[PDB]
Amino acid sequence: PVDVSVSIFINKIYGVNTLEQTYKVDGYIVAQWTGKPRKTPGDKPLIVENTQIERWINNGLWVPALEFINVVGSPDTGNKRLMLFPDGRVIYNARFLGSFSNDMDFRLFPFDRQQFVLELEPFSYNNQQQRFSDIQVYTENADNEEIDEWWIRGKASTHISDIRYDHLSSVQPNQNEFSRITVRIDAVRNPSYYLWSFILPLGLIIAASWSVFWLESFSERLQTSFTLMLTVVAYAFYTSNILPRLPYTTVIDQMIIAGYGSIFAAILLIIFAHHRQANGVEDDLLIQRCRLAFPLGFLAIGCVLVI
Amino acid sequence: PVDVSVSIFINKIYGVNTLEQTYKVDGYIVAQWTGKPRKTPGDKPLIVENTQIERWINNGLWVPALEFINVVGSPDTGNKRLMLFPDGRVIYNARFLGSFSNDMDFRLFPFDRQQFVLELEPFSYNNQQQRFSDIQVYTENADNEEIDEWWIRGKASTHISDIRYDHLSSVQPNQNEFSRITVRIDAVRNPSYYLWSFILPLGLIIAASWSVFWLESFSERLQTSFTLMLTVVAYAFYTSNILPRLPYTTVIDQMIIAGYGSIFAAILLIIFAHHRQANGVEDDLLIQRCRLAFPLGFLAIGCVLVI
Amino acid sequence: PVDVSVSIFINKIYGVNTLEQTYKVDGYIVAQWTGKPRKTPGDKPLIVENTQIERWINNGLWVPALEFINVVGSPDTGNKRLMLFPDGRVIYNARFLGSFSNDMDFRLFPFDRQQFVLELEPFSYNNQQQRFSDIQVYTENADNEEIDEWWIRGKASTHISDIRYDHLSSVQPNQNEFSRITVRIDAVRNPSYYLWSFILPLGLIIAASWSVFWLESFSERLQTSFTLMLTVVAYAFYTSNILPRLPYTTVIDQMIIAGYGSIFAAILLIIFAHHRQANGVEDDLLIQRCRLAFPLGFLAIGCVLVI
Amino acid sequence: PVDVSVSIFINKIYGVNTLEQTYKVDGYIVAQWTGKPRKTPGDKPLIVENTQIERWINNGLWVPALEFINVVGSPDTGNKRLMLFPDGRVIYNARFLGSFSNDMDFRLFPFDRQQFVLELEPFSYNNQQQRFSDIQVYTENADNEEIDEWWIRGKASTHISDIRYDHLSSVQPNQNEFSRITVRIDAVRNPSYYLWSFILPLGLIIAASWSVFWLESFSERLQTSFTLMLTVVAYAFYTSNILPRLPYTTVIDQMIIAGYGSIFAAILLIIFAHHRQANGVEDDLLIQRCRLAFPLGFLAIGCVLVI
Amino acid sequence: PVDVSVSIFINKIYGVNTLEQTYKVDGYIVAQWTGKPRKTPGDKPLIVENTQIERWINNGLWVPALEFINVVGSPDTGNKRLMLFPDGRVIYNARFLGSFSNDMDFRLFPFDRQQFVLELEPFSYNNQQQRFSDIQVYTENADNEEIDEWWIRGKASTHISDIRYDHLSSVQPNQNEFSRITVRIDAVRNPSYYLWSFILPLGLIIAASWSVFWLESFSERLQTSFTLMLTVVAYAFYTSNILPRLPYTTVIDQMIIAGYGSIFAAILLIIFAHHRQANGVEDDLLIQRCRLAFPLGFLAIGCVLVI
């Protein structure tokens, strides 16, 4: 059971893919273990650089393949180095950029918060053959968050576990568990742009829609209702052209639907108010009371919506 | 006739491209067979990792090439391993990400349901030379479907078959059959987003369009009809900018066309009512009757559509 | 002069790029010739798979390079095999996916019809050194055309030709000709989507635009004309955001221009009728006349255009 | 100083990237020089194909690296061949597809005209070590200009020069010169599409905007002005969504700004006419003057700006 | 401590990605150091080209791997050469294209100013093993800035520093410092396009929106306000579809929000004027006053909001 100590440096996380639930991570990976002692040039450690590494494998060196479980396709392995010590220690250091997978819930967008995970596991060697001892994940402070799309909330959380693959061969008695490293980094989306350039104008438009009941004529009210409908449609289009593709309704989508329904209920109430009573009465109490009740009814419906 | 037992682990299915009829599949592939026995270091099984694999082949090891039939270009094979047992067993294990093709019908979108298929076949060796014994496909449960784009409905269906290529050589007596593994996985699209953010606003706009006959003046009616047409145009624009490119009409496209035809028929009826009777009679009976005859008749039209 | 018999299996054609005039083609390529006999294990033919291929070339085996002339960049070569027969026969079989070029005229879109071409030619060896004997192009029937964007109409047309590169050396007497295989596949675009969601709504919008002359007042007519102009603009925008990039006007672009001109001529005719006569006359007869002359006149203009 | 004669075949130029000032070039490159004589298999010249080339380099063959200076990243080198003659001649032939950069000015778009340049230079050897003797550039006729986006004006123009890199070491006396081949191909953009589907509808919209002064009432004029503003806005959006991204104002952008300013000046003139006279006399005389003075000053500006 | 002198030639900077804070840089990298003398053919230095370089490493040539710190994934290594001198000097020259990251603040867009940085560092060798001696950064003048997207303001600033990695082993006394080269290039964005086609039309639209108070009727004012709102919505749509994605509000976004607020305050003031005094007195004094307070107050608040 070989003891392996790892350390993963994280340079950047970016490239959010909402539909595919992937994210790009660039950083470093260090893995250290202890092998048979060896003679080096002098007693100083030996340095082996990318191509030369393969040579040592062809001559019998054991370098285990550590696979990113949650990765998406072969990542872009940058420079890689082996440091070989005379006492047998071996250190594998590699720059890596890769697309990783994780369950991501975007329903509370733009106020969502996610957690980027990394999953390391030996590809061929089990835990009875090769064991994980140490994890250390370092994230740069970068406290000037205002510029970045995402805000990291705390340093990385680690988790070593043992994964049991049930569905395997039947001649292998007990060598079916593997040592898996899982790294989690919580982060929150910066909603400033969506607050100011999406939410605030939408609320202003809906308030303007409420301002329809201050028209004197019925024809004016009903005709302007369609201008309001078209306004909401154009705004929803601008929205959808900017916002990311998704298979569920975002919060902004819900505000859009709320504006649609408010205008629809306004049209219904306008028609009803004009054609309610007898003796050619428009029920002036209904119109001039709705002129202030409609904002409060909608605000109560929205405070119930946030639940 | 070599008996090969395979096992395909499916990690993720995503990236549907509607125009190309492709979908990306990331997972593992395992293949086991029995060859001539071999001496290993001790009687313990030997493990060979990516680069060294090629070396063993150059010294005479026979590793057959298994091609994904329905694949699109060279897939991205990640880490790969050979496990060699002293009794002759050989196991090939490889991580793979690839884009696959299949007939996909999106006419009932966004309520469509598809089936992702995989087709494995030996590239050069026929069925009289190399045979498939077992198929085993494992899919993760992933029971929090509400977030995922597609909902897997059931376990995978497998089928070993014999494929016969007619157009071949003329010296080949009986070596013209191949062993093909076929895996099918049914799936259904999540229609929530298109129901709430597309279907509901489209229907609400169509109802608001119906509300034109409740106008008193004729000029108001005809002038407002054009604002309604422009609303439907902007809505169809927003729709088409979001929805996937396709060569046929989706259900939503049909609803857009239905809104167009509804407004056009409304304009025709408005003109008819204004100039049906003599001496400039409005024919208010027609206007009042269609005020509620358009909804029932159009729902009947859509019902005869759906069936 | 080596006789080479080829066979090209065409699995799928897709991914047309209008601006680049490229299209993606995935299939197989087979090339067969007869060489000096060779010793195999037994008298059964020998099979060589991807990597080992290079070894055989390095030991003196002659494998000619066949270049796709009309391809765009290095294609994605999948699995490849060499079949070596004891009598000297050699068969090269390779899976290939590539982007190919051909002159493509999209003026009649969405009613255009194109033909996908493939051009094979030996890269270095001339016709006095290497000759093409047979071509056979196989495409699966796939008679369920309704799903696919393009409809293949008949089997591929083949043509062996000899191409003479003029600009060559001046000491070379006659070794300047090459054997080129040309494959052509005619196909027609499925216009259903563009028929129903583009052409039909456009005609409906243009007829509704003509319906402006049924307004009683002049001011109503002129004010509504601008709502119609904006409607056409929004429609052209929807179109252009959806339709493929091109450097020339499609049929749909001309229909957009036709709607533009119809609305503009309508505005011109409205002003003319308002100010045709002296003493504040409206020339209502002109409005009544154009009310039906615009359908007839514009459809006569469209039918003269379609000749 | 070795004399090297090259030959560049140009198959296609496409894929202009406006922001990056890049263009895709697909063609062939041939380079010939004369070396020490050599023994061939038989007395006929020997042909070496892609993979074998590297082997021949390891055995002492001198093949200089010729770099495309203005290229962007590693181009896609397809098949490459060495033709070795017994008299010592060496010919390197390779298919190449690459993205190239050059100063491109798009200010007069869609009436712009550009020139595609290619820049070849030996990577390691100077002019005293390796010299360019001949250039021969072959460009396809492509006389079906109506379909192609760009019109080539003439065959390629070439220019060999010697480049001196100032910023270098101080021990190198005069070996700081390199032989650079420069190929230039002038071309003019076909403006038909942008003329008919962009310029003409925009001018028609602006003329309709001029038609505001023929409204009788003041309220009609001022209220219609805002729908006209909205029309220009929607058109400008359609424009910018189709037209290529750029860091400067195109001619079409200038026409958009001209329409905007025309509508704004129209609003100014409308309000001025309404309140130029005391007691708010409408001053219809000003409207009757400006209705045909405004297009006059506009088209005067349109002819002036051309200078 | 090996002294290494570098030289970085910068060919082009482009491809700014606002969300990822990356930019593509193409140029050359030169590295010079002095090793033990060597026998060459003659006294002229020996030149080694790309592939052969790798061979020389397997036979014992020491070429240190220098990594770009701020790069994103393996850069696109073009041609590379080794020049070996008899006096012991060794020079590595390589063409490179890569994606680089740096803190980039786009808040003052379109007047933003950024700085493109490059960070060079040895991958495996520390400063006691390998040191940087000289920096020389050469940038082409390119003084025709008007065409290019970005304008470089001054020549590059260079800086050698020593970077200390804390998290390392604990037996290593002082081998925790590395020699880092830092290159900074200030640059300013070309605002012409965003000035003329975005800022100026937006200001004209806002002034036109102010021109609503010159309407005589109350209904005219209130109904026209909604057309103005819709105009602002379409304009914001056009902007956001063209402008680059960002997580914060640009200056242009602030102007859009300001137009929104102007229209909303105009509606508020209209309603207030309609119901300011008893009996729904319209308060013509309020309209007179606001006709000049709204523009002047907007100028004052806009001048306040920038300091």
Side-chain angles (χ1 to χ4, degrees), chain B residues 219-233:
Chain B
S219 169
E220 299 169 22
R221 257 123 54 192
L222 194 54
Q223 286 193 346
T224 280
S225 279
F226 300 114
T227 299
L228 290 174
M229 202 58 153
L230 175 59
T231 303
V232 171
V233 160

Side-chain angles (χ1 to χ4, degrees), chain A residues 17 19-22 54 57-60 63-75 100-107 122-125 129 165 167-169 171-172 175 178 218-219 222-223 226-227 229-230 233-234 236-238 240-241 243 245-250 253-254 256-257 260-261 264 267 271 274-275, chain B residues 9 11-12 14-15 24 26 28 32 45 47-52 55 76-81 83 85 89 91 93-95 97 136 138 140 144 146-149 190-194 196-198 200-201 203-205 207-209 211-212 214-216 220 223-224 227-228 230-232 234-235 237-239 241-242 245 291:
Chain A
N17 190 333
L19 247 182
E20 299 177 357
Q21 300 189 58
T22 73
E54 202 185 300
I57 301 191
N58 291 340
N59 296 132
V63 178
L66 310 181
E67 164 175 60
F68 285 106
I69 291 301
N70 63 329
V71 86
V72 173
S74 309
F100 299 85
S101 171
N102 178 33
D103 294 326
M104 308 171 79
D105 179 12
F106 298 102
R107 279 173 293 185
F123 190 68
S124 321
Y125 303 103
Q129 295 174 331
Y165 301 115
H167 313 285
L168 222 41
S169 314
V171 199
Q172 302 159 333
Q175 29 189 12
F178 284 76
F218 156 87
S219 170
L222 194 54
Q223 285 193 51
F226 300 116
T227 298
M229 200 62 153
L230 177 60
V233 161
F237 189 3
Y238 142 70
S240 298
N241 167 255
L243 280 314
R245 271 81 147 186
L246 275 183
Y248 35 82
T249 54
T250 78
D253 303 314
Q254 294 191 337
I256 296 293
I257 301 178
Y260 275 136
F264 188 78
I267 296 185
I271 287 185
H274 201 263
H275 286 57
Chain B
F9 299 82
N11 281 346
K12 192 159 94 147
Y14 71 101
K24 298 208 186 77
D26 165 76
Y28 293 83
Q32 177 184 304
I47 275 179
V48 181
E49 281 190 336
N50 314 307
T51 83
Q52 290 311 303
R55 284 231 286 111
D76 183 17
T77 71
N79 295 267
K80 46 186 173 180
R81 107 199 169 206
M83 200 175 303
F85 286 94
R89 293 194 302 268
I91 285 186
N93 178 68
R95 171 71 176 268
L97 162 70
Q136 292 169 332
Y138 306 105
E140 98 178 20
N144 57 257
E146 326 90 294
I147 290 95
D148 291 331
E149 193 187 0
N190 176 15
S192 58
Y193 175 75
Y194 312 100
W196 295 102
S197 299
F198 280 116
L200 178 67
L204 262 45
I205 290 177
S209 75
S211 68
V212 66
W214 305 76
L215 289 172
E216 317 286 3
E220 299 169 22
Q223 286 193 346
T224 280
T227 299
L228 290 174
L230 175 59
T231 303
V232 171
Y235 185 97
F237 186 2
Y238 142 70
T239 289
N241 169 256
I242 280 302
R245 269 77 148 185
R291 282 176 180 177

Side-chain angles (χ1 to χ4, degrees), chain B residues 20 58 67 71 74 219 274, chain C residues 12 28 52 76 216 220:
Chain B
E20 299 177 356
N58 291 340
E67 165 174 60
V71 85
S74 309
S219 169
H274 199 65
Chain C
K12 193 161 95 145
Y28 292 83
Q52 292 311 303
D76 184 17
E216 318 287 2
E220 300 168 22

Side-chain angles (χ1 to χ4, degrees), chain C residues 62 124-126 129, chain D residues 41 44-49 52 56 81-84:
Chain C
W62 179 73
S124 319
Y125 300 101
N126 57 68
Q129 294 173 330
Chain D
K44 312 298 188 250
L46 189 51
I47 277 177
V48 180
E49 280 190 335
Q52 292 311 304
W56 283 73
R81 105 201 168 207
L82 267 184
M83 199 176 302
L84 303 185

Side-chain angles (χ1 to χ4, degrees), chain D:
Chain D
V2 191
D3 285 329
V4 172
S5 154
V6 317
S7 309
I8 288 182
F9 297 81
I10 290 193
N11 282 347
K12 191 161 93 146
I13 298 185
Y14 67 100
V16 184
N17 190 331
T18 72
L19 247 183
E20 300 177 357
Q21 301 189 58
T22 72
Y23 46 85
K24 299 207 186 77
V25 172
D26 164 77
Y28 293 82
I29 176 175
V30 194
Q32 177 183 304
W33 62 89
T34 303
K36 308 188 176 183
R38 191 174 293 99
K39 176 70 177 181
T40 85
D43 257 16
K44 312 298 188 250
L46 189 51
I47 277 177
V48 180
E49 280 190 335
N50 312 306
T51 82
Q52 292 311 304
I53 289 178
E54 202 184 299
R55 286 233 286 111
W56 283 73
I57 302 190
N58 292 340
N59 297 341
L61 184 47
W62 181 78
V63 178
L66 309 182
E67 164 177 61
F68 289 105
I69 294 300
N70 66 328
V71 85
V72 172
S74 310
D76 181 15
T77 72
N79 295 266
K80 47 187 173 180
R81 105 201 168 207
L82 267 184
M83 199 176 302
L84 303 185
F85 290 99
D87 46 298
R89 292 196 301 268
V90 178
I91 283 186
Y92 172 81
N93 176 68
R95 174 73 176 269
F96 78 99
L97 158 65
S99 300
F100 293 84
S101 170
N102 178 34
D103 296 325
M104 306 172 79
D105 178 11
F106 296 100
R107 280 170 294 185
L108 295 95
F109 174 99
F111 307 134
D112 58 340
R113 53 195 314 267
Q114 311 296 338
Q115 55 176 299
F116 312 123
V117 316
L118 275 68
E119 291 190 293
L120 241 193
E121 196 177 299
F123 188 66
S124 321
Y125 303 99
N126 56 68
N127 66 334
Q128 261 170 309
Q129 294 173 330
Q130 194 263 279
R131 212 177 62 93
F132 280 132
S133 64
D134 292 344
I135 329 173
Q136 291 173 333
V137 186
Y138 311 96
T139 74
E140 95 178 20
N141 46 9
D143 204 60
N144 55 256
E145 306 178 68
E146 328 89 294
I147 291 95
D148 289 330
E149 195 186 1
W150 300 85
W151 296 336
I152 311 296
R153 277 251 278 194
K155 288 227 227 167
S157 82
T158 66
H159 179 41
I160 288 189
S161 48
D162 298 286
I163 298 301
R164 180 187 318 273
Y165 302 110
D166 305 297
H167 312 285
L168 221 42
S169 313
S170 197
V171 199
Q172 302 161 334
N174 205 60
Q175 30 189 11
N176 48 69
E177 287 185 330
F178 280 75
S179 188
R180 173 176 293 190
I181 289 172
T182 298
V183 177
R184 290 188 152 89
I185 295 186
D186 298 76
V188 179
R189 190 192 304 262
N190 177 16
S192 59
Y193 175 77
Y194 310 99
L195 275 175
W196 289 102
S197 298
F198 281 116
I199 298 193
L200 179 66
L202 194 274
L204 262 46
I205 291 177
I206 291 187
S209 75
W210 290 338
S211 68
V212 65
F213 303 104
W214 302 77
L215 288 173
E216 320 287 3
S217 165
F218 154 86
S219 170
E220 300 169 23
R221 258 121 52 193
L222 192 53
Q223 287 192 139
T224 280
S225 279
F226 299 116
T227 298
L228 291 173
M229 204 62 151
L230 177 60
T231 304
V232 172
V233 161
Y235 183 94
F237 192 4
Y238 144 71
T239 289
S240 298
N241 167 255
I242 281 302
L243 272 310
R245 271 79 147 186
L246 276 184
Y248 32 61
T249 53
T250 78
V251 163
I252 300 189
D253 304 315
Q254 294 190 15
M255 298 189 58
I256 295 294
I257 299 179
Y260 275 132
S262 159
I263 294 197
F264 188 78
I267 295 186
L268 286 195
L269 258 64
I270 284 185
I271 287 186
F272 194 51
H274 201 65
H275 298 245
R276 194 212 212 256
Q277 310 272 45
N279 225 343
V281 188
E282 286 279 9
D283 193 331
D284 285 335
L285 172 57
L286 214 170
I287 279 280
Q288 280 131 358
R289 295 248 298 187
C290 78
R291 50 186 45 184
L292 261 294
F294 211 173
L296 260 296
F298 183 90
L299 284 170
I301 292 188
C303 296
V304 163
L305 193 150
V306 190
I307 202 179

Side-chain angles (χ1 to χ4, degrees), chain E residues 52-71:
Chain E
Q52 294 312 303
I53 289 178
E54 201 183 299
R55 285 236 288 112
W56 280 70
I57 301 191
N58 290 340
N59 295 342
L61 184 47
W62 177 74
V63 179
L66 308 184
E67 166 174 60
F68 288 108
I69 291 300
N70 63 329
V71 86

